[PDB]
RNA sequence: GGCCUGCU
RNA sequence: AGUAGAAACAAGGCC
């Protein structure tokens, strides 16, 4: 049948028909005589639109050929010939665009004269039947409707017929063409009923080929094809299994508890070696201030400037000269680089304007202590092979180092209070509830707490600088650039001051991965003698640069006043985090007020101002020799302040391991404290889980000996 | 509805013989030379002062095709000779005699 | 006196004050280079957990495979994957008989989906390996070039638009003699089927980074695109069952997690009476992923796909038949140094099966070694066990049927048990009438959870009276305590972009008030905090300060402009009137009435340059990896301001020979923008159909000037314009 | 007129045609994210990492020719080096805030209107009475509740189609709402923003979020009502109870 | 010396 | 040298 489709109609309609064929996913080669069917539709409602043209009027010009004009309108525009979601865009586009009413299914045409829908039709059967079939298969419609049928006869309601009788002359002379055309082919056995409205199909997914011998290779031991498993398994029913293998099974697979009392834990041993050196990237116990004593706030101002009036406020100084060495570096280089620095920040003090921003000469000294040049150049594996000494990076177990005890004064300055006040905080809409009246009275005592606390100044510091070493790193990839280390304070007279700690310079910062390192140089003022506690300072060169005159009754102590030069670096990554250092202030606070809100949801009022005036209530905040001393809610605050700082200063996987794996046995003892008969399956596993974190860092070595004295005070 | 295609044109000598065909009403033999229009060659029977006892028109309405037969043929015969149904037209086919 | 934070325990008990036993504050540790040492330590210790397995090689991919399945029972307390297949199959079974109808509904809603699942919806993932260039790319990326690839070798079922046409593709993929990818450098170049599959069958290995909690660094995986689609739809199937239990705890949130917690606990302790002792397990599984075998998870899914369709079987089946055969790519490589020569060298990992071992130390040497005989086509077979927790619902289901298993029906005893379990972690609160009782019990778990292949961690696991417990960093002492050091990372600028900055700022210290029990004075002195670095970070301080930045001359005359300067954004240089109370308003809106008309007319400008939208789904959408935890995304509310720029992209492209793919991304959002202005819904609801881009165009355009006519702006000399023109690239598309 | 002949153009050269030709409209969505962008791990590190780069930030082509290449001082304003895998620009953060000083100003009444549900939560706390703060223990108790106060009973499938045809009428298909309560939010939300230019795909996502209920679970304590929800943060507490009654009542 | 890139 | 820690950075590539 489908011959005749290949022979009469063109090919415009017979794709068009097969892409329509597509549409529904029904295939061509089981039934073809709908293909013929609604291809001999399309084409009556293609030949009953075209050759049909309007101008302004109505009354269509009808044209056997366009002619080339602006003049080219379609009498009727065609609906069918398109995708579902077409058609459907084209009828919605019309309801509202012609403001009619939309039809449920799909229509043909649409006309301007009487402006609505036709839904052409043509069918075996006559058409006094089709007509009102497909009427009531349509609710309630205005669209006018139309059909043929092969006798040749025409119908419709309202009696109206749209357009010129020549035009359905032509239509049923079409229409007995295809009738007397069938005629030698032959067809009416099955054209006057092919199609009943089949619509069914089954989802098929087969696993055959390659895929289904891997099935067979993905069984139990003792299977040999899929089907078989599955029939196994469709087959098997619970009949004790379990138990036969459990009784079977050996009984030395025993997860027996034992017991945990106060004799059971043993003190965390901690590993023994040379003593911890510093590894922060500032001085934080040994720091000294020069200041000038401004009103501007901690962003306002230009640095260079601040910095040259705060060092032109100190009088004494000496052509500086080496008091400890690096012990591995060439300290003369760190000499050469002081001096470079005071020349070029006098170079600046002459000139017109002091820049935002410096950029320092690259000389030879700056190029070894920034390490310019050093990472070895990137080859190809093919070019060297040959090389004896070529072999993997160094991956071993960092050096083992023991805990001295600096760390732990170190800590106990950081939590003490000061003559300043280091936080200037923000502003925030006006309280207006009374519980935001509490809150901000109590965010005010917690202020006044912690702002005197070098916790507080080591916070702003290490912000500052990571935030001017990170956007010169981002701004200035190339060049060295000089950076004063500057924090501003407010005196208790209340008059606002500037403090110049030192000098960075930052070197080639081409920083692409989070983890790569920029380098950079770092010098601090400081009184505290190096050659007191030399083993604090391994990497560190320190020098003599002056004499300081502080007024003291022992007539005047006149001082001497070092320089402490260092290289150091960090990254992208480390850079972030320090100059979030702030998130510090929020978790020792948010403690302290997690405190505060359980004791009081036990008397039923708020319970702030009691506890941060009356000071009754303490709690055990450190130990010393005569025994636990305790301390007011104040000193809680600034003590977890500062574990706070040191954690985000001491930052190492070695803390992250420690913390976990001690937390586990702090819940444990706290178990056993609270009498409920804590058990264990292994503690020496867990054991050796905690002390294999404790390698070399001084804050996780401070952490595990304060665990190790915690555990001795409890279990008690 | 009525398309038309010739058959049976192509390069003769003078005095030779040529039969043109057409596979498909009243059906006319046309023939269109290189520098002019239309001319009247045949229809079915009547033929052109310029063809007549040379050319012969037949149809076999069974086979539903229309027959020129070409005898004696002259160099001014050539000409792209159409066949047309009675508004149809075929594309024609081309006769060169020489 | 000597100070010592860790002395507050002894006045406040530890659950009370966690949260300073969190490190939260610093920078969390990163691997630095390559992580094929993890992976191939990870391959290595996988196959020996397994040793006393059966050894097979593949007659397809010729890679040896381990099958430890019905092995020998273990004989000590190690981590062992000697599961066994019939102890599994009545887990299950009871799983069943104690939840009724459960496989076969979940197949049916399963069976639901896969056949009206749409293609697209791979494209909702994260980076896939791509085997078309043998690299991690976007989903979508890698997704478009394997079907580039599969309709130039011709495999054009996918042209349906459904995923199971999809992966029906995928599998005929399979049984194809000769394969062709393209390769820059354009190459076209031939795989054979032994390649192509071990390129479908690999898996991409990196090292996890910003994990918080382990001295150690660990490997994870990241699979193909063909195995993405089984993979979907078999945690579908998973996450519908687990759905229907309530001991499972995977499918759920963190406060979902607390209230089953919570509900448990008092359940198995307020049912036992005076005589009867509980006990509660803090439970954590060593070696989790590593001890899974996917033919285990075969039978399970079998087992639950029992009396259902062959073909949903099958499609179920497809996925643990590929892991049960996978394969992994060791890594990026090894880099050497040489100190004498003063140079560097990257070896790609490919090269581990045949470079010498002269370069490398006793460790790495001896885990080559070891894993050189797994070595195929430069991956290894992972065949015994999960890489990386990729069936997590399925490994949460067998969790759960082990926690079902002891309902006090199956224990036949005296003691029983219950509890959570969430893949890796579990709580475990059994009940016995006396400690020999618990003692047996809990031997009885032990041991049943070593016929399933699930072994327990005895170094991170203890056990104590039930009223005090641990459970994903969620610590029960009598009722929840919260500890607010887990979402402290998240309270600084998110990084997406001012506006959306801000709202996520101060939506988090919303929530953390909310949930974490965050104080007031607490969440006053967040949002100052918060202010603070959103101003240092974008350059916008007050405007009436003398902070000289690159951005405060703009800002200072706008300032200077500005009348009513209380409306003026903090982005803009403006006062914060943010408080407790405003939290859960956007900036926009807190300060409307206070914006001058001018200054709000420029800002709230629709015709601005700066705002772009992509889709529904990235409106207002910002993926935030939490601290602890997976990628999360969250809905924040803000307005849609000049300030919802989208930052620059990576720029990186330009010097790697895959410099094409960016013209090709460039022509390709051409297209999609002149489809959406001529289908406006493109974004919203995705266009679907199987016609091409120009046909709907230009049809659209035949009708949209015809009615556009009937009543607008046209003109019948633009609208026959118009016409002819579509004609002209109607004949245009035909040559 | 326009877009018709960008489609020409694109159908000029020859890649462009094989594109859209061989293309079909299903695979719409791939190829429009298909990018080689891959999705920022730590946006934090990097937003404050590029802040600190000249041209931070990208804009359409347009902007080139409505803010000036430079300032009054000479700070560059845009840069006209395309982005890597788009033809917008990179462009300094000062070009926003130059647009909100200097740039085209608009008629931005009708954002309320828009944007209902913030200027909406805008209005019930503006006329919110606050009380006393009572101190005692809270039995936070965790529950299923509506987060969105403003939900009209349709879920997310069945508001899609209400919002697709007030928004985009036309390609609403075979869908015709049938409850009269979806007629009604039609015929409001039409009329409403008839001409409102912001966006149709935020518009959309707005009337996505307005109309459609949404549902989390969360500890309260009391309350357990929409309009006291929202507020959660603000009238519960750990040890401490703030009365609180939003304008609405 | 000149130019390109900074998660590809 | 320095940062850092089971492998890396201490710029890369292209001419």
């Given at each position: 049948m489908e011959d005749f489709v290949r022979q009469c109609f063109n090919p415009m309609i017979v794709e068009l028909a097969e892409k329509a064929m597509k549409e529904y996913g029904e295939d061509l080669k089981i039934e073809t005589n709908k293909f013929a069917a609604i291809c001999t539709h399309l084409e009556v409602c293609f030949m009953y639109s075209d050759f049909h043209f309007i101008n302004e009027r109505?009354?269509?010009?009808?044209?056997?050929?366009?002619?080339?004009?602006?003049?080219?309108?379609?009498?009727?525009?065609?609906?069918?010939?398109?995708?579902?979601?077409?058609?459907?865009?084209?009828?919605?586009?019309?309801?509202?665009?012609?403001?009619?009413?939309?039809?449920?299914?799909?229509?043909?045409?649409?006309?301007?004269?009487?402006?609505?829908?036709?839904?052409?039709?043509?069918?075996?059967?006559?058409?006094?039947?089709?007509?009102?079939?497909?009427?009531?298969?349509?609710?309630?419609?205005?669209?006018?409707?139309?059909?043929?049928?092969?006798?040749?006869?025409?119908?419709?309601?309202?009696?109206?017929?749209?357009?010129?009788?020549?035009?359905?002359?032509?239509?049923?002379?079409?229409?007995?063409?295809?009738?007397?055309?069938?005629?030698?082919?032959?067809?009416?056995?099955?054209?006057?009923?092919?199609?009943?409205?089949?619509?069914?199909?089954?989802?098929?997914?087969?696993?055959?080929?390659?895929?289904?011998?891997?099935?067979?290779?993905?069984?139990?031991?003792?299977?040999?094809?899929?089907?078989?498993?599955?029939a196994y398994v469709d087959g098997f029913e619970p009949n004790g299994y379990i138990e036969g293998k459990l009784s079977q099974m050996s009984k030395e697979v025993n997860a027996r508890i034992e017991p945990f009392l106060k004799t059971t834990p043993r003190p965390l041993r901690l590993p023994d070696g040379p003593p911890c050196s510093q590894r922060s990237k500032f001085l934080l116990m040994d720091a000294l201030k020069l200041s000038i004593e401004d009103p501007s706030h901690e962003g306002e101002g230009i640095p260079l400037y601040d910095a040259i009036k705060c060092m032109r406020t100190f009088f004494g100084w000496k052509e500086?000269?080496?008091?400890?060495?690096?012990?591995?570096?060439?300290?003369?280089?760190?000499?050469?680089?002081?001096?470079?620095?005071?020349?070029?920040?006098?170079?600046?003090?002459?000139?017109?304007?002091?820049?935002?921003?410096?950029?320092?000469?690259?000389?030879?000294?700056?190029?070894?202590?920034?390490?310019?040049?050093?990472?070895?150049?990137?080859?190809?594996?093919?070019?060297?092979?040959?090389?004896?000494?070529?072999?993997?990076?160094?991956?071993?177990?960092?050096?083992?180092?023991?805990?001295?005890?600096?760390?732990?004064?170190?800590?106990?300055?950081?939590?003490?209070?000061?003559?300043?006040?280091?936080?200037?905080?923000?502003?925030?809409?006006?309280?207006?509830?009374?519980?935001?009246?509490?809150?901000?009275?109590?965010?005010?005592?917690?202020?006044?707490?912690?702002?005197?606390?070098?916790?507080?100044?080591?916070?702003?510091?290490?912000?500052?600088?990571?935030?001017?070493?990170?956007?010169?790193?981002?701004?200035?990839?190339?060049?060295?650039?000089?950076?004063?280390?500057?924090?501003?304070?407010?005196?208790?007279?209340?008059?606002?001051?500037?403090?110049?700690?030192?000098?960075?310079?930052?070197?080639?910062?081409?920083?692409?991965?989070?983890?790569?390192?920029?380098?950079?140089?770092?010098?601090?003022?400081?009184?505290?003698?190096?050659?007191?506690?030399?083993?604090?300072?391994?990497?560190?060169?320190?020098?003599?640069?002056?004499?300081?005159?502080?007024?003291?009754?022992?007539?005047?102590?006149?001082?001497?006043?070092?320089?402490?030069?260092?290289?150091?670096?960090?990254?992208?990554?480390?850079?972030?985090?320090?100059?979030?250092?702030?998130?510090?202030?929020?978790?020792?606070?948010?403690?302290?007020?997690?405190?505060?809100?359980?004791?009081?949801?036990?008397?039923?009022?708020?319970?702030?101002?009691?506890?941060?005036?009356?000071?009754?209530?303490?709690?055990?905040?450190?130990?010393?020799?005569?025994?636990?001393?305790?301390?007011?809610?104040?000193?809680?605050?600034?003590?977890?302040?500062?574990?706070?700082?040191?954690?985000?200063?001491?930052?190492?996987?070695?803390?992250?391991?420690?913390?976990?794996?001690?937390?586990?046995?702090?819940?444990?003892?706290?178990?056993?404290?609270?009498?409920?008969?804590?058990?264990?399956?292994?503690?020496?596993?867990?054991?050796?889980?905690?002390?294999?974190?404790?390698?070399?860092?001084?804050?996780?070595?401070?952490?595990?000996?304060?665990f190790n004295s915690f555990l001795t005070h409890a279990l008690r | 509805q009525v398309q038309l295609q010739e058959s049976g044109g192509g390069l003769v000598q003078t005095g030779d013989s040529l039969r043109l065909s057409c596979a498909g009403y009243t059906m006319g033999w046309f023939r269109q030379a290189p520098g002019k229009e239309r001319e009247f060659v045949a229809a079915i029977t009547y033929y052109a002062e310029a063809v007549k006892g040379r050319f012969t028109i037949s149809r076999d309405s069974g086979k539903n095709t229309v027959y020129l037969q070409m005898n004696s043929l002259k160099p001014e015969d050539t000409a792209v000779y159409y066949c047309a149904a009675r508004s149809f037209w075929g594309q024609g086919t081309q006769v060169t005699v020489s | 006196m000597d100070v010592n934070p860790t002395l507050l325990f002894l006045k406040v008990p530890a659950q009370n004050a966690i949260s300073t036993?969190?490190?939260?504050?610093?920078?969390?540790?990163?691997?630095?280079?390559?992580?094929?040492?993890?992976?191939?330590?990870?391959?290595?210790?996988?196959?020996?957990?397994?040793?006393?397995?059966?050894?097979?090689?593949?007659?397809?991919?010729?890679?040896?495979?381990?099958?430890?399945?019905?092995?020998?029972?273990?004989?000590?307390?190690?981590?062992?994957?000697?599961?066994?297949?019939?102890?599994?199959?009545?887990?299950?079974?009871?799983?069943?008989?104690?939840?009724?109808?459960?496989?076969?509904?979940?197949?049916?809603?399963?069976?639901?989906?896969?056949?009206?699942?749409?293609?697209?919806?791979?494209?909702?993932?994260?980076?896939?390996?791509?085997?078309?260039?043998?690299?991690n790319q976007p989903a979508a990326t890698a997704l478009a070039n394997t079907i580039e690839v599969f309709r130039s070798n011709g495999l054009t079922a996918n042209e349906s638009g459904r995923l199971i046409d999809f992966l029906k593709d995928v599998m005929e993929s399979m049984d194809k003699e000769e394969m062709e990818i393209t390769t820059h450098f354009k190459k076209k170049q031939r795989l054979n089927k032994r390649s192509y599959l071990i390129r479908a069958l690999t898996l991409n290995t990196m090292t996890k980074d910003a994990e918080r909690g382990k001295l150690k660094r660990r490997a994870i995986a990241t699979p193909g695109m063909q195995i993405r689609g089984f993979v979907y739809f078999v945690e579908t199937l998973a996450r519908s069952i687990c759905e229907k239990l309530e001991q499972s705890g995977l499918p759920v949130g963190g406060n979902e997690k607390k209230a089953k917690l919570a509900n448990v606990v008092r359940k198995m302790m307020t049912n036992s009476q005076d005589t009867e002792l509980s006990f509660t397990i803090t439970g954590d599984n060593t070696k989790w992923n590593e001890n899974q075998n996917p033919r285990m998870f075969l039978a399970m899914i079998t087992y639950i796909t029992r009396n259902q369709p062959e073909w949903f079987r099958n499609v179920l089946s497809i996925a643990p038949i590929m892991f049960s055969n996978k394969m992994a790519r060791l890594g990026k490589g090894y880099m050497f140094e040489s100190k004498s020569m003063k140079l560097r060298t990257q070896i790609p990992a490919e090269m581990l099966a045949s470079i010498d071992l002269k370069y490398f130390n006793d460790s790495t040497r001896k885990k080559i070694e070891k894993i050189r005989p797994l070595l195929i086509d430069g991956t290894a077979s992972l065949s015994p066990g999960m890489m990386m927790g990729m069936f997590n619902m399925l490994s949460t289901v067998l969790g759960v049927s082990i926690l079902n298993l002891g309902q006090k029906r199956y224990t036949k005893t005296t003691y029983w048990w219950d509890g959570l379990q969430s893949s890796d972690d579990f709580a475990l609160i059994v009940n016995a009438p006396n400690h020999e009782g618990i003692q047996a019990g809990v031997d009885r778990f032990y041991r049943t959870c070593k016929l399933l292949g699930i072994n327990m961690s005895k170094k991170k696991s203890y056990i104590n009276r039930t009223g005090t417990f641990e459970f994903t960093s969620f610590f029960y002492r009598y009722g929840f305590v919260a500890n607010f050091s887990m979402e402290l990372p998240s309270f600084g600028v998110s990084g997406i972009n001012e506006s959306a900055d801000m709202s996520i700022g101060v939506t988090v210290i919303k929530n953390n008030m909310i949930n974490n029990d965050l104080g007031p004075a607490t969440a006053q002195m967040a949002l100052q905090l918060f202010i603070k670095d959103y101003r240092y970070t974008y350059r916008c301080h007050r405007g009436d300060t003398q902070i000289q930045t690159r951005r405060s001359f703009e800002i200072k005359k706008l300032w200077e402009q500005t009348r009513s300067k209380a409306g003026l954004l903090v982005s803009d240089g403006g006062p914060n009137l943010y408080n407790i109370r405003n939290l859960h308003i956007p900036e926009v809106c807190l300060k409307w009435e206070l914006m001058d008309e001018d200054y709000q007319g420029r800002l709230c400008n629709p015709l601005n340059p700066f705002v772009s939208h992509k889709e529904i789904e990235s409106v207002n959408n910002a993926v935030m990896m939490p601290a602890h935890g997976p990628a999360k995304n969250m809905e924040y509310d803000a307005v849609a301001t000049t300030h919802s720029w989208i930052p620059k992209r990576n720029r990186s492209i330009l010097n790697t020979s895959q410099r094409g793919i960016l013209e090709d991304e460039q022509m390709y959002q051409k297209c999609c923008n002149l489809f959406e202005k001529f289908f406006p819904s493109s974004s919203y609801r995705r266009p679907v159909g199987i016609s091409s881009m120009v046909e709907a165009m230009v049809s659209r355009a035949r009708i949209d000037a015809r009615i556009d006519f009937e009543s607008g702006r046209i003109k019948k000399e633009e609208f026959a314009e118009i016409m002819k023109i579509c004609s002209t690239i109607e004949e245009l598309r035909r040559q | 007129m326009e877009r018709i002949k960008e489609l020409r153009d694109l159908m000029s050269q020859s890649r462009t045609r094989e594109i859209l030709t061989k293309t079909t409209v299903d695979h719409m969505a791939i190829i429009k994210k298909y990018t080689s962008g891959r999705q920022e791990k730590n946006p934090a590190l990097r937003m404050k990492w590029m802040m600190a780069m000249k041209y931070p930030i990208t804009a359409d082509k347009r902007i080139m020719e409505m803010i000036p290449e430079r300032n009054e001082q000479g700070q560059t304003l845009w840069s006209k080096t395309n982005d890597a895998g788009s033809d917008r620009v990179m462009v300094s953060p000062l070009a926003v805030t130059w647009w909100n000083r200097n740039g085209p100003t608009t008629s931005a009444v009708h954002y309320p209107k828009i944007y209902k549900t913030y200027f909406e939560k805008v209005e019930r706390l503006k006329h919110g009475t606050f009380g006393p703060v009572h101190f005692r223990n809270q039995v936070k108790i965790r529950r299923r509740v509506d987060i969105n106060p403003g939900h009209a009973d349709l879920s997310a499938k069945e508001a899609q189609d209400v919002i697709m045809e007030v928004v985009f009428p036309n390609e609403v298909g075979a869908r015709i709402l049938t409850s009269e309560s979806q007629l009604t939010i039609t015929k409001e939300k039409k009329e409403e923003l008839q001409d409102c230019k912001i966006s149709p795909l935020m518009v959309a996502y707005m009337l996505e979020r307005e109309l459609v209920r949404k549902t989390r679970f969360l500890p309260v304590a009391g309350g357990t009502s929409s309009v006291y929800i929202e507020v959660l943060h603000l009238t519960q507490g750990t040890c401490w109870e703030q009365m609180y009654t939003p304008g609405g009542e």
């Amino acid at each position: 049948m489908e011959d005749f489709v290949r022979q009469c109609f063109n090919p415009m309609i017979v794709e068009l028909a097969e892409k329509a064929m597509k549409e529904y996913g029904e295939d061509l080669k089981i039934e073809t005589n709908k293909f013929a069917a609604i291809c001999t539709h399309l084409e009556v409602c293609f030949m009953y639109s075209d050759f049909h043209f309007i101008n302004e009027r109505g009354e269509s010009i009808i044209v056997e050929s366009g002619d080339p004009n602006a003049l080219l309108k379609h009498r009727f525009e065609i609906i069918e010939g398109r995708d579902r979601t077409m058609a459907w865009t084209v009828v919605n586009s019309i309801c509202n665009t012609t403001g009619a009413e939309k039809p449920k299914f799909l229509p043909d045409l649409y006309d301007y004269k009487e402006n609505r829908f036709i839904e052409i039709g043509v069918t075996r059967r006559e058409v006094h039947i089709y007509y009102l079939e497909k009427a009531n298969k349509i609710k309630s419609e205005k669209t006018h409707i139309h059909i043929f049928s092969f006798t040749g006869e025409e119908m419709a309601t309202k009696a109206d017929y749209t357009l010129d009788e020549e035009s359905r002359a032509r239509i049923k002379t079409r229409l007995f063409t295809i009738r007397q055309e069938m005629a030698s082919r032959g067809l009416w056995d099955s054209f006057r009923q092919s199609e009943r409205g089949e619509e069914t199909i089954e989802e098929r997914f087969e696993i055959t080929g390659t895929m289904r011998r891997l099935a067979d290779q993905s069984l139990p031991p003792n299977f040999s094809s899929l089907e078989n498993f599955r029939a196994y398994v469709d087959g098997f029913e619970p009949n004790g299994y379990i138990e036969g293998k459990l009784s079977q099974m050996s009984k030395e697979v025993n997860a027996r508890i034992e017991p945990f009392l106060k004799t059971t834990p043993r003190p965390l041993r901690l590993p023994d070696g040379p003593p911890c050196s510093q590894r922060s990237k500032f001085l934080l116990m040994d720091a000294l201030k020069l200041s000038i004593e401004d009103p501007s706030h901690e962003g306002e101002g230009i640095p260079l400037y601040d910095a040259i009036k705060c060092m032109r406020t100190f009088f004494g100084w000496k052509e500086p000269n080496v008091v400890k060495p690096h012990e591995k570096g060439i300290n003369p280089n760190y000499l050469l680089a002081w001096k470079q620095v005071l020349a070029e920040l006098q170079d600046i003090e002459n000139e017109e304007k002091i820049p935002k921003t410096k950029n320092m000469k690259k000389t030879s000294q700056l190029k070894w202590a920034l390490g310019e040049n050093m990472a070895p150049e990137k080859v190809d594996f093919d070019d060297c092979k040959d090389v004896s000494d070529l072999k993997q990076y160094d991956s071993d177990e960092p050096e083992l180092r023991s805990l001295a005890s600096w760390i732990q004064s170190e800590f106990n300055k950081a939590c003490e209070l000061t003559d300043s006040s280091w936080i200037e905080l923000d502003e925030i809409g006006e309280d207006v509830a009374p519980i935001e009246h509490i809150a901000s009275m109590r965010r005010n005592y917690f202020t006044a707490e912690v702002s005197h606390c070098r916790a507080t100044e080591y916070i702003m510091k290490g912000v500052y600088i990571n935030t001017a070493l990170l956007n010169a790193s981002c701004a200035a990839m190339d060049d060295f650039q000089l950076i004063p280390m500057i924090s501003k304070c407010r005196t208790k007279e209340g008059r606002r001051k500037t403090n110049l700690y030192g000098f960075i310079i930052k070197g080639r910062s081409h920083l692409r991965n989070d983890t790569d390192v920029v380098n950079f140089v770092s010098m601090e003022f400081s009184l505290t003698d190096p050659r007191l506690e030399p083993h604090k300072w391994e990497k560190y060169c320190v020098l003599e640069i002056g004499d300081m005159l502080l007024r003291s009754a022992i007539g005047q102590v006149s001082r001497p006043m070092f320089l402490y030069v260092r290289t150091n670096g960090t990254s992208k990554i480390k850079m972030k985090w320090g100059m979030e250092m702030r998130r510090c202030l929020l978790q020792s606070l948010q403690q302290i007020e997690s405190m505060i809100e359980a004791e009081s949801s036990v008397k039923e009022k708020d319970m702030t101002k009691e506890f941060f005036e009356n000071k009754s209530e303490t709690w055990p905040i450190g130990e010393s020799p005569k025994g636990v001393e305790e301390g007011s809610i104040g000193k809680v605050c600034r003590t977890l302040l500062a574990k706070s700082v040191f954690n985000s200063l001491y930052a190492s996987p070695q803390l992250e391991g420690f913390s976990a794996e001690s937390r586990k046995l702090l819940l444990i003892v706290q178990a056993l404290r609270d009498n409920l008969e804590p058990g264990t399956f292994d503690l020496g596993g867990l054991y050796e889980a905690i002390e294999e974190c404790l390698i070399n860092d001084p804050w996780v070595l401070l952490n595990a000996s304060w665990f190790n004295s915690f555990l001795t005070h409890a279990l008690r | 509805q009525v398309q038309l295609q010739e058959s049976g044109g192509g390069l003769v000598q003078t005095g030779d013989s040529l039969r043109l065909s057409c596979a498909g009403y009243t059906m006319g033999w046309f023939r269109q030379a290189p520098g002019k229009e239309r001319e009247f060659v045949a229809a079915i029977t009547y033929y052109a002062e310029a063809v007549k006892g040379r050319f012969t028109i037949s149809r076999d309405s069974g086979k539903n095709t229309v027959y020129l037969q070409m005898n004696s043929l002259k160099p001014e015969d050539t000409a792209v000779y159409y066949c047309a149904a009675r508004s149809f037209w075929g594309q024609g086919t081309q006769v060169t005699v020489s | 006196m000597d100070v010592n934070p860790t002395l507050l325990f002894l006045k406040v008990p530890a659950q009370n004050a966690i949260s300073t036993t969190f490190p939260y504050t610093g920078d969390p540790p990163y691997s630095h280079g390559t992580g094929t040492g993890y992976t191939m330590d990870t391959v290595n210790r996988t196959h020996q957990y397994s040793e006393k397995g059966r050894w097979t090689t593949n007659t397809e991919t010729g890679a040896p495979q381990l099958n430890p399945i019905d092995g020998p029972l273990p004989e000590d307390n190690e981590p062992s994957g000697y599961a066994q297949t019939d102890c599994v199959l009545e887990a299950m079974a009871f799983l069943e008989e104690s939840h009724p109808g459960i496989f076969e509904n979940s197949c049916l809603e399963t069976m639901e989906v896969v056949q009206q699942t749409r293609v697209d919806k791979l494209t909702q993932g994260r980076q896939t390996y791509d085997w078309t260039l043998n690299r991690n790319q976007p989903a979508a990326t890698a997704l478009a070039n394997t079907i580039e690839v599969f309709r130039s070798n011709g495999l054009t079922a996918n042209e349906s638009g459904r995923l199971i046409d999809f992966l029906k593709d995928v599998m005929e993929s399979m049984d194809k003699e000769e394969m062709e990818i393209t390769t820059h450098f354009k190459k076209k170049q031939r795989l054979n089927k032994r390649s192509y599959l071990i390129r479908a069958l690999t898996l991409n290995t990196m090292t996890k980074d910003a994990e918080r909690g382990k001295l150690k660094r660990r490997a994870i995986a990241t699979p193909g695109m063909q195995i993405r689609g089984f993979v979907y739809f078999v945690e579908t199937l998973a996450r519908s069952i687990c759905e229907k239990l309530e001991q499972s705890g995977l499918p759920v949130g963190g406060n979902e997690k607390k209230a089953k917690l919570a509900n448990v606990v008092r359940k198995m302790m307020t049912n036992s009476q005076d005589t009867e002792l509980s006990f509660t397990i803090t439970g954590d599984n060593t070696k989790w992923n590593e001890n899974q075998n996917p033919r285990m998870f075969l039978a399970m899914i079998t087992y639950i796909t029992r009396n259902q369709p062959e073909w949903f079987r099958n499609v179920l089946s497809i996925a643990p038949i590929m892991f049960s055969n996978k394969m992994a790519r060791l890594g990026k490589g090894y880099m050497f140094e040489s100190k004498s020569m003063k140079l560097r060298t990257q070896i790609p990992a490919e090269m581990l099966a045949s470079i010498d071992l002269k370069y490398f130390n006793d460790s790495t040497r001896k885990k080559i070694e070891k894993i050189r005989p797994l070595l195929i086509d430069g991956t290894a077979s992972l065949s015994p066990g999960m890489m990386m927790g990729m069936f997590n619902m399925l490994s949460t289901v067998l969790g759960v049927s082990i926690l079902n298993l002891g309902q006090k029906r199956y224990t036949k005893t005296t003691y029983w048990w219950d509890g959570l379990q969430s893949s890796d972690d579990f709580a475990l609160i059994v009940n016995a009438p006396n400690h020999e009782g618990i003692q047996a019990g809990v031997d009885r778990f032990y041991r049943t959870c070593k016929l399933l292949g699930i072994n327990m961690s005895k170094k991170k696991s203890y056990i104590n009276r039930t009223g005090t417990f641990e459970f994903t960093s969620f610590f029960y002492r009598y009722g929840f305590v919260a500890n607010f050091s887990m979402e402290l990372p998240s309270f600084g600028v998110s990084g997406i972009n001012e506006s959306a900055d801000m709202s996520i700022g101060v939506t988090v210290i919303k929530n953390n008030m909310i949930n974490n029990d965050l104080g007031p004075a607490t969440a006053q002195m967040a949002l100052q905090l918060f202010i603070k670095d959103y101003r240092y970070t974008y350059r916008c301080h007050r405007g009436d300060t003398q902070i000289q930045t690159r951005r405060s001359f703009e800002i200072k005359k706008l300032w200077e402009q500005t009348r009513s300067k209380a409306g003026l954004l903090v982005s803009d240089g403006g006062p914060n009137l943010y408080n407790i109370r405003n939290l859960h308003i956007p900036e926009v809106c807190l300060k409307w009435e206070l914006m001058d008309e001018d200054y709000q007319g420029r800002l709230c400008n629709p015709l601005n340059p700066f705002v772009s939208h992509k889709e529904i789904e990235s409106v207002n959408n910002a993926v935030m990896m939490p601290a602890h935890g997976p990628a999360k995304n969250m809905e924040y509310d803000a307005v849609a301001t000049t300030h919802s720029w989208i930052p620059k992209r990576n720029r990186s492209i330009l010097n790697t020979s895959q410099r094409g793919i960016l013209e090709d991304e460039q022509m390709y959002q051409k297209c999609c923008n002149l489809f959406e202005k001529f289908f406006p819904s493109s974004s919203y609801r995705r266009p679907v159909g199987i016609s091409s881009m120009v046909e709907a165009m230009v049809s659209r355009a035949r009708i949209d000037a015809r009615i556009d006519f009937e009543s607008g702006r046209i003109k019948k000399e633009e609208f026959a314009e118009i016409m002819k023109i579509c004609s002209t690239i109607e004949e245009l598309r035909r040559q | 007129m326009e877009r018709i002949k960008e489609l020409r153009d694109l159908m000029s050269q020859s890649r462009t045609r094989e594109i859209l030709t061989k293309t079909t409209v299903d695979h719409m969505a791939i190829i429009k994210k298909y990018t080689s962008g891959r999705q920022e791990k730590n946006p934090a590190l990097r937003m404050k990492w590029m802040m600190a780069m000249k041209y931070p930030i990208t804009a359409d082509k347009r902007i080139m020719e409505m803010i000036p290449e430079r300032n009054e001082q000479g700070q560059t304003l845009w840069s006209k080096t395309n982005d890597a895998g788009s033809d917008r620009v990179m462009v300094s953060p000062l070009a926003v805030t130059w647009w909100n000083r200097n740039g085209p100003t608009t008629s931005a009444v009708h954002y309320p209107k828009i944007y209902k549900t913030y200027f909406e939560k805008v209005e019930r706390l503006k006329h919110g009475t606050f009380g006393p703060v009572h101190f005692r223990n809270q039995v936070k108790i965790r529950r299923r509740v509506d987060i969105n106060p403003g939900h009209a009973d349709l879920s997310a499938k069945e508001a899609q189609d209400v919002i697709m045809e007030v928004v985009f009428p036309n390609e609403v298909g075979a869908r015709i709402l049938t409850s009269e309560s979806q007629l009604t939010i039609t015929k409001e939300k039409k009329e409403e923003l008839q001409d409102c230019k912001i966006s149709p795909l935020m518009v959309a996502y707005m009337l996505e979020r307005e109309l459609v209920r949404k549902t989390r679970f969360l500890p309260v304590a009391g309350g357990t009502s929409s309009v006291y929800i929202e507020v959660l943060h603000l009238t519960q507490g750990t040890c401490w109870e703030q009365m609180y009654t939003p304008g609405g009542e």
